[PDB]
RNA sequence: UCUGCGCAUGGCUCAUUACAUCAGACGUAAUCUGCCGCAAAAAUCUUGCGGUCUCCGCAACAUUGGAUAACUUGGCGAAACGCCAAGCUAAUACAUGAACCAACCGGAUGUUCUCUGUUCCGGCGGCAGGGCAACCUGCUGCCAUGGGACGUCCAGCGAAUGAAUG
RNA sequence: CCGGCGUCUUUUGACGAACAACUGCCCUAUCAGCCAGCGAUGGCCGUGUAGUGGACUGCCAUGGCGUUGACGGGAGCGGGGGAUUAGGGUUCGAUUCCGGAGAGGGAGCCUGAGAAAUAGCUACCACUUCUACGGAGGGCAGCAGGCGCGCAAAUUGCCCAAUGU
């Protein structure tokens, strides 16, 4: 029995509420969960609808995303590094949304190749495009930092995004 | 011969996945093998008293299958057949019978 | 570009949802006057934005001049009683009140707590005008739309 | 969830009594509301009188020899609002449900031709897949819609054998409406000014023949047609024109005599 | 007896209970929703025949698959809306699975060939001499606005994340 | 050749559900300070849920309410309405309709579109039944009918014909 309510909380003038009902299934929590590094584990659990919905544990694969070159290709999360929530978390190996953490960079270092007939066009897209300095460096090494934007406890899945300057910069500087 | 289990002097059944020569207490759903289907509503289970997979002196009766099948014949079971109460229905099964 | 230290003081980085603010080749015109990239949003029911939101510095989630909060119901006005809090204000009102049996007045208040933009600062004895706004705290449940 | 309708709980227009059990029927979803409508059974029995008695209505309905919009309907109850046809073969009577003055149901006959025409409002108009155009009144769907696109609060003319649709009519000045709801239903008038207020509940002006105008609001109002000559579809012996209490009463008086 | 639907409604009672309940007036762009109304749906290498090398040739209206109750046989228990072993057989249960017929629209591409470069200054190089492959020299091919055909991979509904339109 | 049924998936209406609060309501000051260790008011990134939210974790601020009666206590299910009445009022509303909550006292859970369901399940406490003592059960604030209690309240009938599900 996890409730959602403001029935057991106090008032705003210090007082203390009385009741005269019981509880619901109309409010209810779920334990957390906490979804780390490894194999794909899922857990399957029903709401209200009758649909389900995939609670994830251990999740070491990923998706993720420039912005700029609006492409999404693949990689394998390796390390998490930094969290702003807790550094519980970041210890635990665990995934949140808003986490920073590191990934493999290959198929990105691999598509930014492509950026016969061909021969023309890896002139044209080329041109009128520079690569962030920030970002090279990193790019070029084999791990990036990359930034997960989804919730990795009620997909199942994790998905982000991938950091450019501003962004970039206000977080190196912690590490 | 196999095993697969009777009944207790109390008329309890046996389990084969607890282990002990003993009673002991289980929540058991509708599918499983000390509360019938249909005796309660769907989702339903009950504790029920049952015992382990274990054999001691307790045990009123025993059940067990012919595997190996040796001299003196067990009489009326080795002795007699009985044939099928029903023939099959569905048509391929009735192809495949007569292998027509 | 390289990172403010008074539009950021937190933990975690500060930035608004809505567009893309890496960005980058910038690709036009969603920018104000001009200037980097941002967002805001033209509320009806016949109030105008600010002139400040439009053109402003700040990251907040929950002013529906650069948030997707919605402003729908009911419009309602109050004075303001004290500034305290970040970015929480707090409404007086007074009104009247009619016995049947006596057929006279009396007087009463009420007291609201509000949420206020970084984009206005009213003070205390200021009127204002506010809307209706889903939770966005537990008291909360009106926002600011126009200072007087 | 409820299941079951009481004779107290249930609208005055279906003028069923306080006594004689404490049970209505409760109309299932469907084309219209619960608040208002005809349910099925309460037709048939209570106006027609083709039943005396609930068994008897079922024993007629449940042969599927009652078709609302051309299609046999088997169920005791299922609802029937505002501008919809009941053809019933067997007796060679057509109805077309309406409102009148008194706030109250009516019923019309109609021949050949407009048994097989309808109106629909337009509710909302929104997009879906392959940007498909959609519209959304009281009955139904139905999907694209030309005649020619436009705009919401608007009346189409609609054919229930297969579509021709003949135009539609719009919400304009100088046009004529039947109202709903509001207790000032079962009334008629023409379109004069109509008040936006924005965020808030919008606000019309009308009038009627001879004057004595009044004001309703816009989710009250259904267009009809352009003009009373234009109109596609045809209405009761009154005009809905309201009368003044002793008016009425004194008429009745002096016509008693028989 | 298996299967599908319903028993969360109706009945009965006021014990708790004052930003609590409730009434009037509003909101959900913060959400779910079986039965009912109306309306949609162009995805998927399947089956039979013949041979066999695993993979082919030849056809076209899919002759799909594996189980379990009632019943019978042994029963157990003092009782119990308590229960067990074995043998039988069904589906709108449960599990598979459908080519051509059958459309419109877009992406990414081949060291594919042919209209062609009208076209050089640079690029991509390809070679030898010095070659430390820094580069200098000499030699050499193609490209420096393009489009036609042929071939390959991807494309549906719904869901997640990142760009763009609104 | 033609027709009537049935079902998977998608979309949105009304049959519903959940959540939020602008205004209002008995008596008491011999109840004047009430709210943060154990969230009190707000802020930031998260987590959870059908979804919004101190609903909850971590971190950071010091606020919130009140003599225009807070906090605490007493009486009480709320409303439509009833009785009395020139008028102003006083008083009652358990009870036919509408809303809420409950099913010996507490808690936890399964199934399902919807329940924290009790003529569903699990455990404990109180009470209690049958037994061959090895065990297995019960929940009338549903209709009849008892027992106790109190100044005080009906048949252990007939029927689905009507009115509904």
């Keep these: ?175 | 011969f196999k095993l697969q289990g009777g009944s207790d002097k109390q008329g309890f059944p046996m389990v084969q996945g607890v282990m002990a020569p003993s009673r002991v207490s289980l929540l058991v759903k509708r599918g499983a093998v000390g509360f019938n289907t249909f005796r309660g509503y769907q989702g339903e289970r009950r504790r029920k008293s049952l015992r382990g997979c274990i054999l001691a002196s307790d045990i009123a009766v025993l059940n067990v299958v012919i595997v190996k099948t040796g001299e003196q014949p067990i009489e009326g079971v080795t002795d007699v057949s009985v044939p099928r109460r029903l023939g099959p229905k569905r048509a391929n099964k009735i192809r495949k019978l007569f292998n027509l | 570009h390289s990172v403010d230290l008074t539009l950021q003081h937190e933990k975690a980085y500060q930035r608004q949802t809505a567009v893309n603010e890496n960005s980058h080749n910038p690709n036009k015109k969603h920018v104000n006057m001009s200037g980097h990239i941002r967002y805001s949003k033209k509320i009806g029911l016949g109030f105008k934005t600010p002139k400040s939101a439009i053109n402003g510095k700040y990251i907040d989630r929950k002013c529906p001049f650069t948030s997707d909060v919605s402003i729908r119901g009911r419009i309602l006005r109050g004075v303001v009683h004290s500034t305290k809090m970040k970015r929480s204000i707090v409404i007086r009102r007074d009104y009247l009140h009619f016995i049947r049996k006596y057929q006279r007045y009396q007087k009463r208040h009420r007291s609201l707590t509000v949420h206020c933009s970084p984009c206005f600062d009213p003070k205390p004895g200021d009127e204002v005008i506010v809307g209706q706004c889903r939770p966005l705290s537990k008291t909360i449940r009106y926002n600011v739309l126009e200072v007087v | 969830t409820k299941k079951h309708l009481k004779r107290l709980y249930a609208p005055k227009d279906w003028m069923l009594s306080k006594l004689t059990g404490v049970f209505a029927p409760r109309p299932r979803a469907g084309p219209h509301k619960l608040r208002e409508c005809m349910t099925l059974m309460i037709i048939i029995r209570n106006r027609l009188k083709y039943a005396l008695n609930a068994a008897e209505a079922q024993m007629i309905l449940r042969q599927g020899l009652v078709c609302v919009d051309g299609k046999p309907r088997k169920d005791t109850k299922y609802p029937v609002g505002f501008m919809d046809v009941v053809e019933i073969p067997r007796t060679g009577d057509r109805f077309r449900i309406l409102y009148d003055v008194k706030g109250r149901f009516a019923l019309v006959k109609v021949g050949e031709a407009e048994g097989n025409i309808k109106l629909l409002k337009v509710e909302n108009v929104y997009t879906s897949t392959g940007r498909i155009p959609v519209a959304m009144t009281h009955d139904g769907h139905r999907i694209r819609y030309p005649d020619p696109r436009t705009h919401r609060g608007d009346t189409l003319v609609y054919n229930l054998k297969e579509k021709k649709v003949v135009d539609l009519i719009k919400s304009s000045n100088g046009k004529v409406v039947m109202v709903t709801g509001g207790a000032n239903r079962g009334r008629i008038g023409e379109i004069m000014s109509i008040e936006r207020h924005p965020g808030a509940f919008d606000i019309a002006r009308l009038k009627d023949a001879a004057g004595h105008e009044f004001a309703t609001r816009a989710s009250n109002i259904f267009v009809i047609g352009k003009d009373m000559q234009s109109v596609p579809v045809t209405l009761p012996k009154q005009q809905g024109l309201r009368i003044n209490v002793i008016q009425e009463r004194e008429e009745k008086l002096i016509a008693a005599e028989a």
């Design chain 1, 1 to 175: 029995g996890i409730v959602r309510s403001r029935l057991h909380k106090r008032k705003i003038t210090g007082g203390k509420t009385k009741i005269h009902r019981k509880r619901m299934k109309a409010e209810l929590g779920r334990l957390p969960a906490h979804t780390k590094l490894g194999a794909r584990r899922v857990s399957p659990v029903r709401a209200r609808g009758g649909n389900f919905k995939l609670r994830g544990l251990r999740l070491d694969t990923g998706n993720f995303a420039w912005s700029t070159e609006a492409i999404a290709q693949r990689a394998r999360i390796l390390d998490v590094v930094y969290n702003a929530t807790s550094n519980e978390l970041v210890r635990t190996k665990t995934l949140v949304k808003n986490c920073i953490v590191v990934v493999d960079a290959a198929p990105f270092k691999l598509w930014y190749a492509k950026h016969d007939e061909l021969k023309r066009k890896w002139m044209l897209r080329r041109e009128n495009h520079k690569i962030e300095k920030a970002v090279a460096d990193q790019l070029k090494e084999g791990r990036l930092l990359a930034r997960i934007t989804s919730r990795p406890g009620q997909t199942a899945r994790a998905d982000g995004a991938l950091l450019e300057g501003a962004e970039l910069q206000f977080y190196l500087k912690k590490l």
